[PDB]
Structure formats: C-alpha cells, structure tokens
Design an enzyme around this catalytic site. Structure first.
Site, PDB file in Angstrom:
ATOM      1  N   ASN A 142      42.819  42.639  37.435  1.00 58.73           N
ATOM      2  CA  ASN A 142      42.446  41.947  38.694  1.00 58.73           C
ATOM      3  C   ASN A 142      43.486  40.906  39.058  1.00 58.73           C
ATOM      4  O   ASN A 142      44.262  40.424  38.184  1.00 58.73           O
ATOM      5  CB  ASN A 142      41.026  41.355  38.580  1.00 58.73           C
ATOM      6  CG  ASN A 142      40.902  40.310  37.506  1.00 58.73           C
ATOM      7  OD1 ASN A 142      40.993  39.117  37.800  1.00 58.73           O
ATOM      8  ND2 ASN A 142      40.758  40.725  36.257  1.00 58.73           N
ATOM      9  N   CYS A 148      55.073  34.186  44.451  1.00 60.74           N
ATOM     10  CA  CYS A 148      56.195  34.282  45.361  1.00 60.74           C
ATOM     11  C   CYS A 148      56.065  35.386  46.413  1.00 60.74           C
ATOM     12  O   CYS A 148      56.472  35.191  47.574  1.00 60.74           O
ATOM     13  CB  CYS A 148      57.525  34.497  44.632  1.00 60.74           C
ATOM     14  SG  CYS A 148      58.254  33.075  43.833  1.00 60.74           S
ATOM     15  N   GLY A 188      43.076  49.260  28.789  1.00 66.46           N
ATOM     16  CA  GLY A 188      44.001  50.358  28.653  1.00 66.46           C
ATOM     17  C   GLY A 188      45.438  50.003  28.336  1.00 66.46           C
ATOM     18  O   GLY A 188      45.993  50.457  27.334  1.00 66.46           O
ATOM     19  N   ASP A 194      40.800  38.411  25.749  1.00 65.66           N
ATOM     20  CA  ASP A 194      39.972  39.272  26.623  1.00 65.66           C
ATOM     21  C   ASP A 194      38.530  38.868  26.497  1.00 65.66           C
ATOM     22  O   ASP A 194      38.136  38.345  25.487  1.00 65.66           O
ATOM     23  CB  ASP A 194      40.109  40.784  26.286  1.00 65.66           C
ATOM     24  CG  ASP A 194      39.859  41.694  27.507  1.00 65.66           C
ATOM     25  OD1 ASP A 194      39.060  41.351  28.395  1.00 65.66           O
ATOM     26  OD2 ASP A 194      40.498  42.758  27.624  1.00 65.66           O
ATOM     27  N   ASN A 231      37.001  34.266  29.015  1.00 69.42           N
ATOM     28  CA  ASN A 231      37.532  34.441  30.351  1.00 69.42           C
ATOM     29  C   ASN A 231      38.427  33.239  30.627  1.00 69.42           C
ATOM     30  O   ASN A 231      37.936  32.103  30.848  1.00 69.42           O
ATOM     31  CB  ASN A 231      36.358  34.481  31.377  1.00 69.42           C
ATOM     32  CG  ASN A 231      36.829  34.700  32.808  1.00 69.42           C
ATOM     33  OD1 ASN A 231      38.006  34.618  33.124  1.00 69.42           O
ATOM     34  ND2 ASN A 231      35.873  34.835  33.703  1.00 69.42           N
ATOM     35  N   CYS A 272      36.822  57.197  36.556  1.00 71.50           N
ATOM     36  CA  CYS A 272      38.258  57.048  36.808  1.00 71.50           C
ATOM     37  C   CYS A 272      38.984  58.400  36.892  1.00 71.50           C
ATOM     38  O   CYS A 272      38.471  59.427  36.420  1.00 71.50           O
ATOM     39  CB  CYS A 272      38.917  56.142  35.749  1.00 71.50           C
ATOM     40  SG  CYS A 272      39.587  56.949  34.256  1.00 71.50           S
ATOM     41  N   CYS A 283      57.493  29.115  47.891  1.00 72.42           N
ATOM     42  CA  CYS A 283      56.346  29.637  47.157  1.00 72.42           C
ATOM     43  C   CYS A 283      55.156  28.666  47.180  1.00 72.42           C
ATOM     44  O   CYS A 283      55.315  27.415  47.122  1.00 72.42           O
ATOM     45  CB  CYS A 283      56.696  29.915  45.696  1.00 72.42           C
ATOM     46  SG  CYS A 283      55.281  30.430  44.725  1.00 72.42           S
ATOM     47  N   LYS A 310      36.266  43.548  22.774  1.00 70.79           N
ATOM     48  CA  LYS A 310      37.533  44.241  22.761  1.00 70.79           C
ATOM     49  C   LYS A 310      38.560  43.571  21.858  1.00 70.79           C
ATOM     50  O   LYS A 310      39.269  44.273  21.121  1.00 70.79           O
ATOM     51  CB  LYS A 310      38.117  44.392  24.142  1.00 70.79           C
ATOM     52  CG  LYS A 310      37.266  45.282  25.062  1.00 70.79           C
ATOM     53  CD  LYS A 310      38.020  45.503  26.358  1.00 70.79           C
ATOM     54  CE  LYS A 310      37.562  46.756  27.102  1.00 70.79           C
ATOM     55  NZ  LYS A 310      38.351  46.848  28.371  1.00 70.79           N
ATOM     56  N   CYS A 331      57.923  34.472  40.755  1.00 71.07           N
ATOM     57  CA  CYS A 331      56.590  34.378  40.144  1.00 71.07           C
ATOM     58  C   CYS A 331      55.637  35.289  40.941  1.00 71.07           C
ATOM     59  O   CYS A 331      56.002  35.838  41.985  1.00 71.07           O
ATOM     60  CB  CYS A 331      56.116  32.917  40.050  1.00 71.07           C
ATOM     61  SG  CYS A 331      55.166  32.257  41.477  1.00 71.07           S
TER      62      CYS A 331
HETATM   63 ZN   LIG Z   1      56.637  31.503  43.059  1.00 69.79          ZN
END
Ligand SMILES: [Zn+2]
Ligand SMILES: [Zn+2]
Lengths: 80, 239, 260, 80
Positions: C114, C159, C16, C37, C80, C174, C227, C57, C156
């Site tokens: 995800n 973090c 999307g 993708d 992937n 949906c 971090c 896609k 990031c």
């Molecule tokens: Zn970080």
C-alpha cells in the site's frame, strides 16, 4: 580471413575484429574471442546475424564462406 | 486461470533453479509435476515432500535416476510421452534446470526425437549471468544448433541464490505465458546481473544442425507453415 | 564476499515480495535481518506453508529462516509502522538495530502492499537520512519495479507521487502469475542490495519489469527541488554540501589469430 | 501549452502530444495521458527527461514553465 565478433550479453554490444588463416579451426577463433571479451570460452557459443546457430568445429575459411564476417557470441550458462 | 490445473510439466534438475521453479508452479496450481534428478532421501523425494505440503492437490511423479544412461533414456522418453496429466498423453512442457551440458544434450536429443517443446535454463558459475530459452523442435533453435565450445570441440566436462531466483522466476513466467496464452513468450531471454541487461532474441534453427531429428523437425515445420475518456472537461486535445 | 556478514537489512512487509527477499538474503549470509509486518499468515492469500496459518508473518518467517541459515541474526516486530507510537519505535530500530546495536541498519527495503506504508517509510528515511529500496508489483502481475532512494541524492517516493497520493484520494481498490512476478522482483531487488552493499557491478536507481514483453527499463530519478517532504529538501541541501566537500593473456596462440 | 508524454514501461516508448489550457491542473493531463496509454491513472506518476520527479498537483502552465514539454509517465506498482 576476417571476422567481426560481437558480445551479445554486454549492453554495449562490443565487438572484436580478428584476422585468421583459413585453415584455423573456428573453435580457436571462438576461444580467442571469448578470451578478448574475458568471458569463459568453454561455455560460449556462436551465432550469425540472423540468429542462426553455428557449430564452430569447422575451418575459419568455411565459416567465412557459409556465414560471412559478422558473428555473435552467446553465453551457454551451465549451472542450475 | 484454472486452465493451469489441466497441464503437466516435467522438470529435470531440482537444485537451485529447478527447486524454485517447482515451487512456483506448485503454488500456481499446476495439474502435475514430473521431477527428474540424480544424486537419507534422494533430491527428488525431498523436493516432493516439501512441495506436497505446499499444495496437496498437485499430482507428482518423481524419478531418481540419471537420464543420460541407455536404460534410463528410454524410460525418460516414455514418461515425457505418456506421463502427462492424463496417462498415455505427453507432458505439456519439459524444463531443463540441470547443471551440466551432457544432460542438456540428452534432453535435447529426446525432445527432437519426440517433437516435444521444452525450455532451457541456466546460470553462470560466478552468478553474474543467466538465461532461458524456448526450444520448439523445428521452429526455434535446439540446443545442438549452437553448441558451446566444449560440446562442439568434444572436450569432456571434467550471489548464486539470487541469480537462480531471477532465472527461475523469468522461466516460470515464460511457462505461464506459453501455457495460458497471455503476453509475448520469449524464445530467448538473457540476464546480465552486473549491468541489469536482459536481452531478448529469437534464435532460428540451424539447417545443418548435428541433431538429425532437429533437421527432420525443421522439414516438418516448413511444411506445416506452407500449409497456410468518461469526461473531457478541460478541452485537452490529442495532437 | 564475507563482507555480506557485516551488514544489516530491514525488510518492511513480509508478504510475497518480502518473504522471498528475506529468504534470498538469508541464503546469501547477510549479517542480520530486521523484519516488520503486522498481518498473519492465511490459507486465503508464496513462502509460507499451510501449517503456519494463524501465526504472525514475521514469526513464521523467522522460524523458517533461522533454520535455513543459523548464523544470520534476526530481530522481528509484529506491528503496524504507520501508527504514531510504532512510528517512533520503527525509527529507533532503523537507527540502532544494525548488526552492531547502536548503529543504523545499512538498508531498509519496502515490500509493502500500500502507498500509505510506503509514505511512512519514506517519511522516516528522509528524517533519518537512511538509504532504502522500494519495490512493487502491479495488481494484475503484469508489471513491477525496484527503486533506490538515497535521501537527498536520488528521488524520494514523495518526489514523484502517484496520482492518488498527489490528489489525496483514499486507497480504496489474485492473478495466477502474482507469485512469479513477486519472485522476479524480489530477485532483482536482492541483486541490487548485493551490488550496493558489496560494490560490484552497476547499482540501478530504478529497474522496471514488464512481464508481457520482457522489458526491463532502467532510469535514474533525481530529487524534486520542491518535494512535499521537507526532510527530502533538507537532505538535498546536505547532499549538495557533501558533494562540494568530498591485461589479456591468451593461453597459447598456436594458429596465428591476430586481433586487428 | 503542449506536452509530449512518453510511456516508459512499454519498450516502444510510445508518446502522446497533448495540447492543454494553461489553467488545467496537471493531474487531469496525467489522467488523460494514462487513459490514452490504457494504463491505470491512479498509480501513474510523472517525471521530466532528466528524471526529476514532478508533483502533478499544479497547473499545466507551471509545469510547462518549470519543466518544458517533454514528460514521462512511470508506473507506481502498489502490491507487495
Ligand atoms: Zn522527495
Ligand atoms: Zn538443432
């Protein structure tokens, strides 16, 4: 004679104070204010603090009398 | 929800903003779209061909004419009034995605006469800015309530893809909030892309608006208003 | 400006958000897009057309986008990026798949669905010192955001991890308005891309969208000195070193209007 | 220890004050606060007032010592 005109589309809500003769069409005050804010005059509109639209084709004197000093420019974006 | 299939939306202007907006509503499963624009095929026919392939179950009625001419104005009003999902019923909303003030004023004039709710949208020339606005005639400001300088002064009118997509998206979101009754519908939502500033306002009708139908709608509105923790193991205290 | 033609943008996730984002940049005249993708187009779950069902896609997106603007260069990868082999290839292409081959891309965009893949992008970008923008939409379409990650300079993604990342819970969970919210986010995403690449206006380091109340908060999140990502910490060190070593014309005025 | 936790995604910037034992993992404070705001715990993150991101996998005592009382929940929207 004097207006405080706020630009609504800028997050700093900057304003300009303009002193004007009562006979000046308010269309020229609007233009003048839009020019000070460097936004396009032709597509700007004017509203009051209550968010009431104003037709600027009237004298500055009458705008002052009906709505007072505190006015607000809004863009009227024309493209689509 | 499938309430969305029960609604009809008229879109005027199928350029950048309106084409995205038509696509979003088509994908959502809107019952019907009415498309109006004015120019081998016409823009409304091209738009209809693309949209029908995207969702075959959406009904389309398209009109390639200039709504501002005297003959077409009556047909425009006719279709707003009778071209809803059920023929003889009005559309649920009109959307303005036109590129000029003349056509906004025509839509405004029709909506004030009919008491038809509409949303207005626009983008600035330089893509730096845009907005959406909800006009419920009599209850919120109509487009003539706060005319831009050129309309008020009677002067004849004589990065873009991104700003158009933002405006179309926020427009449609407002459409769905309005039709489906979720969240808060904005009466006005601006977009300043330079500073990411998105001001909301609710602009009220001008009691001396040039549009006399706006005034009458304001009277009718005032009258209508006058008629009425599964666990808490750690002892965390909310102070 | 035609500076836009000199830049390359990688997009991860062409569902999307990413498919709209790809369309917007293509229409803007970006020099090059890199699309990553693995899913196929499906009749079940914006941008794609029905007759494209069953295509990858990235290929489907490439077929449409090439015709919208023939002057945009496209490189696409149907894989992937979280698997060990593909991760190295992903980094190679961020590093060398810019507009001029052998130069890095100017930006990576995260439009994945995800946290695992966000963490993968974050891990690559922190290693490479690659600026990226992250984007997302809530499950119920009520909300979304964009965020600018300049490794070492701003926060990031590790973090300030979400609870599930921090607490090591497996991703295991949906609405009519999903396509609309995705369009808004994509649009503000791309607008930020342009502001960043073209140096106009103010780039947001973070911009939220709450569709219920039309509330769009901005903020600027700073790197976490502790971090979890050790390359984030190293980038923070390198950033600090680098910082330590680097009108009004009124057409007429007939009416005597005075600026007081 | 006491934290004032603000929800950044609501225009009212509402806040909740939570008193917590020092040994409580801050992950449970975050969850508790998300529940009070009726936002999903799993996707919430926590930052300071300066906008420094915080890993909540540490004690409330240490969060307090390293960052003080004034913290801010942000969504981490997961779909794309
Ligand atoms: Zn970080
Ligand atoms: Zn009016």
């Amino acid at each position: 004679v004097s207006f405080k005109i706020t630009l609504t589309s800028d997050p700093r809500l900057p304003y300009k104070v303009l002193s004007v003769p009562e006979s000046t069409p308010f269309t020229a005050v609007l233009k003048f204010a839009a020019e000070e804010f460097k936004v396009p005059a032709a597509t700007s509109a004017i509203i009051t603090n209550d968010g009431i639209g104003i037709n600027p084709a009237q004298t500055a004197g009458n705008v002052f009398l009906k709505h007072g000093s505190e006015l607000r420019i809004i863009p009227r974006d024309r493209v689509g | 929800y499938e309430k969305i299939r029960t609604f009809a939306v008229a879109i005027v202007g199928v350029g950048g903003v309106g084409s995205v907006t038509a696509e979003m509503l088509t994908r959502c499963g809107i019952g019907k779209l009415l498309l109006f624009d004015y120019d081998g095929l016409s823009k409304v026919q091209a738009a209809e061909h693309t949209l029908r392939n995207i969702n075959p179950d959406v009904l389309f009625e398209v009109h390639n004419y200039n709504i501002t001419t005297v003959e077409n104005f009556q047909h425009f009003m006719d279709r707003i009034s009778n071209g809803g999902l059920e023929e003889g019923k009005p559309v649920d909303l009109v959307l303005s995605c036109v590129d000029n003030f003349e056509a906004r004023m025509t839509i405004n004039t029709a909506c004030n006469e009919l008491g038809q709710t509409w949303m207005e949208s626009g983008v600035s020339e330089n893509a730096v800015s845009g907005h959406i606005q909800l006009i419920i005639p009599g209850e919120s400001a109509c487009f003539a309530c706060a005319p831009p300088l050129v309309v008020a002064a009677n002067i004849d009118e004589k990065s873009l893809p991104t700003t158009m997509g933002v405006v179309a998206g926020i427009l449609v979101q407002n459409v769905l909030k309005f039709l489906l009754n979720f969240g808060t519908v904005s009466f006005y939502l601006g977009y300043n892309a330079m500073q990411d500033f998105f001001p909301t306002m609710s602009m009220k009708p001008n009691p001396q608006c040039d549009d006399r139908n706006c005034r009458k709608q304001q009277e009718e509105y005032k009258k209508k208003v006058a008629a009425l923790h599964e666990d808490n193991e750690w002892g965390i205290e909310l102070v």
